[PDB]
Design a binder for this molecule. Structure first.
Ligand code: HEM
Length: 146
């Protein structure tokens, strides 16, 4: 886990993003696919398709939402190793099932801070809190076999 301090910083930077959940959740998903095109392949309707096709999809919102709703729960529990344990196991177990592994989260990690910053400048130290949090995610993926 993260320390309460770290956790606070991550929450603080997240607040503005989550404020506009629907629009921001969609933008995050699109930004990922733009920066890391290979990632669209892990999704049926999105593979073959262009970012423009994705943006136009009636499925976008359902996909990106689930992502934001879970991230929010990770942000909430970050400083409680216990909750994280369980959350991390279940998250990795689910992704590996789909063929997604840490390399994909290394990508998320890479572009995350920049994404948050495009919404509102984060507090000092928030960038490191997210990398740490994504770190926890990457490690869980590696333990789950990918
Ligand atoms: C930012 C971190 C991410 C969060 C918190 C997250 C969260 C989620 C959640 C909670 C589900 C289950 C949705 C449901 O209830 O049906 C899910 C499904 C899945 N995720 Fe992630 N995800 C993230 C990153 C990624 C990445 C990077 C990829 C691919 C590169 C990935 C690919 C998938 C796939 C293929 C599914 C299966 C669901 C489907 O077929 O639509 N996710 N993820």
């Amino acid at each position: 886990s993260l320390s309460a301090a770290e956790a606070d910083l991550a929450g603080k930077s997240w607040a503005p993003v989550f404020a506009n959940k629907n629009a921001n959740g969609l933008d995050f998903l699109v930004a990922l696919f733009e920066k890391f095109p290979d990632s669209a392949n892990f999704f049926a309707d999105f593979k073959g398709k262009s970012v423009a096709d994705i943006k136009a999809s009636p499925k976008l919102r359902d996909v990106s939402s689930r992502i934001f709703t879970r991230l929010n729960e990770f942000v909430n529990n970050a400083a409680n190793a216990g909750k994280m344990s369980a959350m991390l196991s279940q998250f990795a177990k689910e992704h590996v099932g789909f063929g997604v592994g840490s390399a994909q989260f290394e990508n998320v990690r890479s572009m995350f801070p920049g994404f948050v910053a495009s919404v509102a400048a984060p507090p000092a130290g928030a960038d490191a809190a997210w990398t740490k949090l994504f770190g926890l995610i990457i490690d869980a993926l590696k333990a789950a076999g990918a």
